[PDB]
Amino acid sequence: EQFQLRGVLWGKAYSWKITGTTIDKVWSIVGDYVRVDNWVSSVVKSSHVVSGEANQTGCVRRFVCYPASEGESETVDYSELIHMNAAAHQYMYMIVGGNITGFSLMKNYVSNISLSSLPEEDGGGVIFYWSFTAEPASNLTEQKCIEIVFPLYTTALKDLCTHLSIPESSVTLLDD
Amino acid sequence: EQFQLRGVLWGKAYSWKITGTTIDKVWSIVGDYVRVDNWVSSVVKSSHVVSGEANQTGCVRRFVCYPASEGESETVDYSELIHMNAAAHQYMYMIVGGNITGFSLMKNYVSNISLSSLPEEDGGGVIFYWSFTAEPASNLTEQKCIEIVFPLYTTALKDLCTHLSIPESSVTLLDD
Ligand SMILES: N#C[C@H](O)c1ccccc1
Ligand SMILES: N#C[C@H](O)c1ccccc1
């Protein structure tokens, strides 16, 4: 009959329905964690594993982002895979270093990606779940976090369509 | 150009499609965090807020579970709401005390619930997302965690149907 209080978190979860593809085609792009340059190509220039075994839990990827706007420099993200279940199409990662624009402002940014199949008997389709949390910090606000994260996720879903060779109309953000 | 390694996590995410209901109806049961006795009523005997304000971020619920078997005592869960966004039908909580069977064995059990509406042109329906993580510890394995958690989530989806007065066939586990 005792408990230990802890601090609250910031964050938000998003889900999209994607038609016209399959979960394992989506996963071939989205699940190749250390090669995120092959996914979010509107943002990421290059990417490679720098610690551990590629796409195995505990590994760290380092990726380079194009300048956020002209005149700016390239920035770098280090992120650690902290959970991976490839057969269940889901994983979890955290930013552990770098100066990547916006994202490096957050304290303990953790993200979850989980792909699910809608029932074949209902016409199929893929649900793409993507969430983040961050720890509240004096130098930021939850609204700022969401302003940083959501445009990136939106860009990434667009880039996904490009790499799957399906129209952008294939993706629909679900009402929460 | 440096980074610090962090520990990895155990866990799993699950998604169900629920037909014959609306996100508002589901939320009226699932979203009443401190009254989980009015949701998972086959497992939970009673539930009350014991710190903070009911269903506001930071609050702690105390709930009591029926005995696992005859002669066994009731067990107790303390869990803190660490994120709540009711407008977006999503929240996150962690066990912060108690001796609730199985769940109290995990180190830093954290759970996320999200509800999404499928497009009306598709026939509507709700996607129910539910995930957990726990920290690796000597006295458990990830498999043992999954064997604690998934049967409870399954029971909870069944109990949800009872309270919604809809048949269990309304619920389909995605990727079953
Ligand atoms: N780490 C991390 C972020 O989620 C991220 C940022 C840019 C492109 C892909 C992913
Ligand atoms: N806290 C917590 C667990 O997720 C839980 C355990 C039993 C019934 C409802 C919820």
Numbering used by the authors:
A (entry chain B), B (entry chain A): 9 to 184
Please share text taken word for word from the publication where this structure appeared.
Hydroxynitrile lyases (HNLs) catalyze the cleavage of cyanohydrins into the corresponding aldehyde or ketone and hydrogen cyanide123. We discovered a protein with hydroxynitrile forming activity unique within the Bet v1 superfamily.
We also determined the structures of complexes of DtHNL with 4-hydroxy benzaldehyde, benzoic acid and (R)-mandelonitrile/benzaldehyde using soaking techniques. In the complex with (R)-mandelonitrile, the cyano group interacts with the guanidinium group of Arg69 (distance 3.5 Å) and the carboxylic acid group of Asp85 (2.9 Å). The latter interaction requires Asp85 to be protonated in this complex structure. A water molecule bridges the OH-group of Tyr101 and the guanidinium group of Arg69. The negative charge emerging at the cyano group upon C-C bond cleavage is very likely stabilized by the positive charge of Arg69 and a hydrogen bond from the protonated Asp85. Specifically, Arg69 and Tyr101 are directly involved in the catalysis together with a water molecule.
